[PDB]
Amino acid sequence: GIANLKKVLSVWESNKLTNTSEKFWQSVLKENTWILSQIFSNPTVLINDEAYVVDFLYANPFSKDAVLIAIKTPSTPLITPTEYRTGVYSAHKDLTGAVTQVLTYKTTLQREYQNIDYNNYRQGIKTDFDIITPCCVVIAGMFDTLTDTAHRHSFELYRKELKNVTVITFDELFERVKGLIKLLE
Amino acid sequence: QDLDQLNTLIGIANLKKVLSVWESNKLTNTSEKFWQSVLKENTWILSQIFSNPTVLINDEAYVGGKTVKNDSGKLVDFLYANPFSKDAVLIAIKTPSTPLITPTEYRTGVYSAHKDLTGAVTQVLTYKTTLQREYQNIDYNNYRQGDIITPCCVVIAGMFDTLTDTAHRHSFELYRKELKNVTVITFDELFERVKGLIKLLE
Amino acid sequence: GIANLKKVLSVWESNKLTNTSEKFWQSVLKENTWILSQIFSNPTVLINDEAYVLVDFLYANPFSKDAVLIAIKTPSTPLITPTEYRTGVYSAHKDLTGAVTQVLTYKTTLQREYQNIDYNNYRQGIKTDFDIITPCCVVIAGMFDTLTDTAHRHSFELYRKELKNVTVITFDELFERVKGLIKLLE
Amino acid sequence: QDLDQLNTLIGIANLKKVLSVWESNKLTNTSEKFWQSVLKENTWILSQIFSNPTVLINDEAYVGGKTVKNDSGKLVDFLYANPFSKDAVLIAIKTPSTPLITPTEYRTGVYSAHKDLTGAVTQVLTYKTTLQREYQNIDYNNYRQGDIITPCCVVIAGMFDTLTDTAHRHSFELYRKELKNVTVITFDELFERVKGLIKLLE
Numbered sequence: 001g002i003a004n005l006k007k008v009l010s011v012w013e014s015n016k017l018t019n020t021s022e023k024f025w026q027s028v029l030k031e032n033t034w035i036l037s038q039i040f041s042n043p044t045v046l047i048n049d050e051a052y053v054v055d056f057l058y059a060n061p062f063s064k065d066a067v068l069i070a071i072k073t074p075s076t077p078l079i080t081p082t083e084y085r086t087g088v089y090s091a092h093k094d095l096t097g098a099v100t101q102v103l104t105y106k107t108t109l110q111r112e113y114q115n116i117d118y119n120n121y122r123q124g125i126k127t128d129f130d131i132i133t134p135c136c137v138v139i140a141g142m143f144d145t146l147t148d149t150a151h152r153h154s155f156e157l158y159r160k161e162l163k164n165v166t167v168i169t170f171d172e173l174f175e176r177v178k179g180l181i182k183l184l185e
Numbered sequence: 186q187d188l189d190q191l192n193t194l195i196g197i198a199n200l201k202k203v204l205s206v207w208e209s210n211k212l213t214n215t216s217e218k219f220w221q222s223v224l225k226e227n228t229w230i231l232s233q234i235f236s237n238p239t240v241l242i243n244d245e246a247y248v249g250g251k252t253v254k255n256d257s258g259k260l261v262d263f264l265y266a267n268p269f270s271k272d273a274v275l276i277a278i279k280t281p282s283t284p285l286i287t288p289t290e291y292r293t294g295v296y297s298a299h300k301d302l303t304g305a306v307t308q309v310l311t312y313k314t315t316l317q318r319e320y321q322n323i324d325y326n327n328y329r330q331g332d333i334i335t336p337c338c339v340v341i342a343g344m345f346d347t348l349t350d351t352a353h354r355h356s357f358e359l360y361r362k363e364l365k366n367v368t369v370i371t372f373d374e375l376f377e378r379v380k381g382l383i384k385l386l387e
Numbered sequence: 388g389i390a391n392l393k394k395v396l397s398v399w400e401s402n403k404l405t406n407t408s409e410k411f412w413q414s415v416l417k418e419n420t421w422i423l424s425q426i427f428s429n430p431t432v433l434i435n436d437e438a439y440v441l442v443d444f445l446y447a448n449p450f451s452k453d454a455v456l457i458a459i460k461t462p463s464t465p466l467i468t469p470t471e472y473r474t475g476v477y478s479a480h481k482d483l484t485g486a487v488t489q490v491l492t493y494k495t496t497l498q499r500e501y502q503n504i505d506y507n508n509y510r511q512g513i514k515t516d517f518d519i520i521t522p523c524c525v526v527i528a529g530m531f532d533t534l535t536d537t538a539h540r541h542s543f544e545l546y547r548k549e550l551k552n553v554t555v556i557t558f559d560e561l562f563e564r565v566k567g568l569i570k571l572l573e
Numbered sequence: 574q575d576l577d578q579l580n581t582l583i584g585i586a587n588l589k590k591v592l593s594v595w596e597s598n599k600l601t602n603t604s605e606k607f608w609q610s611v612l613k614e615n616t617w618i619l620s621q622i623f624s625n626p627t628v629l630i631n632d633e634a635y636v637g638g639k640t641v642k643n644d645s646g647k648l649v650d651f652l653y654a655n656p657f658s659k660d661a662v663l664i665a666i667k668t669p670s671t672p673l674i675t676p677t678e679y680r681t682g683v684y685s686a687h688k689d690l691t692g693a694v695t696q697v698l699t700y701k702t703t704l705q706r707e708y709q710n711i712d713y714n715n716y717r718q719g720d721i722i723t724p725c726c727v728v729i730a731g732m733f734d735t736l737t738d739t740a741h742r743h744s745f746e747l748y749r750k751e752l753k754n755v756t757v758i759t760f761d762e763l764f765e766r767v768k769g770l771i772k773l774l775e
Binding site (some may be wrong): 107113147163 | 435486495498499503520522551
């Protein structure tokens, strides 16, 4: 119950600034599928990797629409160390490259959907995800690393101009988990 | 930790009653006022679903599922008073028997959004603009004597049961996934996540 | 030159309130490919219908090969519903909303069947200069002049700014660029 | 008739003059000021390319390719004075040698945007916010004594000649097409449409 929710936070806090392996955070969200389900207002269910043979695929159980989620490490920089202009900071190449990569996978997944769908038919797997819209999510970095107001302003501009990619930092992801505790109390 | 178990039961008990009314009058009772009242009393559910501590329903504001009483009676006055609620979610609750797509076909395999559904999306944006100007008007007066809210908009109308076709569901998704600042979630989708919360708590 | 530009407006000014056939407006834009190329700041070139096979045009950037799908309706296509949802609130007409859904559906199909389309061009010997990299769509329908009341314009502006990947452009706005080009030169 | 032919020749002569400058030192001159000066004396070209009669380069405003003489020296003053010029396109002109993507690969087939390119995109957005803030500042003062400009942003930098692979071109497109209020057009793309205008006229 709620003790399970607190356990997730304890795991999150313990490796908040130490773990730098994408595989570990892959497991944590895979073990607790409800964590990523809180991002989307519409209901979502996890899709097994075999169905579409460090990303996750969540699909709406009603419309079968699928959303692709890419998970990086919390230590991923959000902005460049130096500043392009006084008070203007460029988004780090790690963040910009991550956004591009998830779009490429979404393009590839839709372009090869017929091959994947037919393979599931042969193997008996029931395909429950339909690529209707190019919605992607990139979970990376921590918002707390942005100290200066210029840093927060520069990063906020980057994450507001994106059309179909929602960049969510790790701390914001677990704030929904932590926020659930407060609402229950 | 014992109270945490008590909180778990209290949270589940509230969720069961919300599903109880939904699974009892989702077909007969179709008045907008009734469904607004039900979701008002269970605002804490909406806070988690839309990932926003502060929500705006009708002419009232609820923070963390708590009714924030405002003596002035103006939603804008509360929003200006508290800078925290500058990213609140505006929710318009319609009847669950609201058509989502036109019964006929615009083309082969394409269904256009129904009048009622796209009317609500226009209405909430109109309501959002009015709140923005009233907030701006107060800011001008305070400056005269001596920002912009930009709240999120969410429309809750219709059920996914009426979409009894792949074309019906695909057309609806292409509509609601194209809006920038409006999220359309059906009543069936709304209460199915309520079931998910029960499963997570249990 | 300029005389050519004024000739195009003569056709537009003559058929904007008379011609209600979708095929005719396809012919006009197909004859003058430069008209639709003025919508996009980046260079674009029209792709023949044989290459990638409702009126639909396909323009591709000559450099990055990115393709854009444009759907053309009639100028007589309503933009908003005749009645009002609420007092001062008008809904977008089903013709406009349905047109947006259809162009997105065709864009989805075009990307999904790209491998077959690319392979067919290889067999037929045709080159494939278009690539579906981004889901960008354009819908051309109706005229902005038909929105007389300030509520009508506000209701339509809310809808068109709300869209993510579809840019609804009325006919008069499209041909205003043609008229705008004349004034800049003159 | 006679006037049209004279205007057609003037337009073609102007367009060919710009191409002569572009094709004479696109590989030698890297001064950002130089390319700002060249592209601001031919603003009528930019008006048609970006489909906007009003163009804002640096702190100077151009309407229909004509230099507006604002004696105040503040760009916002002109914008507030003239309600017509509210959707003006803000254009930032960089050197054509500006890199577009990182020379190394982020992954297998994925390239991230270069620091200079993404730095300019943030800079114009910062410039846009300052103009919006100053526009309100004037508007607030007028109210005390007795809306929102929300313009567009365009960045012109780099050449497509650097992108010598399919992966490079796909990566660049996935970046600029994802932006909402910023349009990125390379110098090679900018003058390609200049050639297209000549073909249309001639």
